[PDB]
A paper describes a structure:
The protein kinase ERK2 is recurrently mutated in human squamous cell carcinomas and other tumors. Though distributed throughout the primary sequence, the most recurrent mutations (E81K, R135K, D321N, and E322K) map to a three-dimensional hotspot at the so-called common docking (CD) site within the ERK2 catalytic domain. This site is located at one end of the docking recruitment site (DRS), a shallow groove opposite the catalytic cleft that serves as a hub for interactions integral to ERK signaling. The DRS binds to short linear sequence motifs termed docking sites (or D-sites), often found in intrinsically disordered regions of interacting proteins.
Residue numbers in the entry:
A (entry chain I): 168 to 181
B (entry chain A): 11 to 174, 184 to 330, 335 to 356
Amino acid sequence: IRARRGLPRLAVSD
Amino acid sequence: PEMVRGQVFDVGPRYTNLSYIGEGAYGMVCSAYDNLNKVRVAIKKISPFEHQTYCQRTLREIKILLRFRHENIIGINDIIRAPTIEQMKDVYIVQDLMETDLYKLLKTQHLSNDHICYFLYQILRGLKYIHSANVLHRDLKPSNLLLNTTCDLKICDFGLARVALTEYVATRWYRAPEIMLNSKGYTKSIDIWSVGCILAEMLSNRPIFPGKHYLDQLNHILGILGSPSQEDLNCIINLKARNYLLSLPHKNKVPWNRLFPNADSKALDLLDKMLTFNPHKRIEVEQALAHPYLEQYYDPSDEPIAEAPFKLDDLPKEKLKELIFEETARFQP
Ligand SMILES: Nc1ncnc2c1ncn2[C@@H]1O[C@H](COP(=O)(O)OP(=O)(O)NP(=O)(O)O)[C@@H](O)[C@H]1O
């Protein structure tokens, strides 16, 4: 979802 | 035929290089390399044909997951079973490989408010599709929320889903109080309650309503929500359940910000609406998605619903084995 909508990557480790 | 932790996995030659992932109460899950699509997948082995309840779980999960198509719901890529019904004793269900689940994550790390928001959004976006198909999942819990490193989430484990209870389950901590009060006539609101429990557990890394049985679980629920109001007692129609509630000592409500002093106040407002004792006043999935806490994700143009809603418990295990054989025939060469 985030990638398709152009939002920055959200990683589990952060 | 390759073996994993003593159990056989007869999935070759298409799937190879097995690696143990884990086990639920009904299946053993490994990863494998799919030599057709040239990627690693997950494979769940089920051996259900000896018991009525096992067969039901297998048939329900396969019939539903084969007909669902949604980004936040696990799919079935393939199903392996013997070419004859007499030789069919195991079923192997092949799915997209995910990296972990929310249960295992919450045992290891804090979730930031950004994580919690994004996971909650995806749970409800998936649930919006499920409920639009007129299906109840009925067993939402952290262990069946699959996750990958980019925080994509998929709901899995539909063995208890029904179109809108005595069997064994690994955990009852996410079940709605109206299930425990034998109110019957369960609705989509039981899924919202479970999501409420999962949200609370993301905020604190602890289950909010643990308990050794329903009586103990209800005491945990009432110890936080407080004793039900007069109006709440009217939604409990079962004679014995209502008398039981009336027999309990009065308990005060605990403010959410005392239990979760570091949580986003918007998250607590939405939590309050999901963990509403009265199932008729509990928030519905569409209203939950529109809640201010999820404002950066609510996007009704990008939240698909089922094109059409869906519209067995008295069948013997031999008849269910037939139906299982039939629904899986499409994957045979
Ligand atoms: N597609 C998958 N990708 C990665 N891990 C998975 C996948 N499916 C299941 N798992 C892991 O294996 C565990 C058991 O899976 P589940 O699908 O929940 O099993 P069950 O035995 O059929 N039902 P339950 O008793 O409710 O767990 C899950 O909790 C996940 O950690």
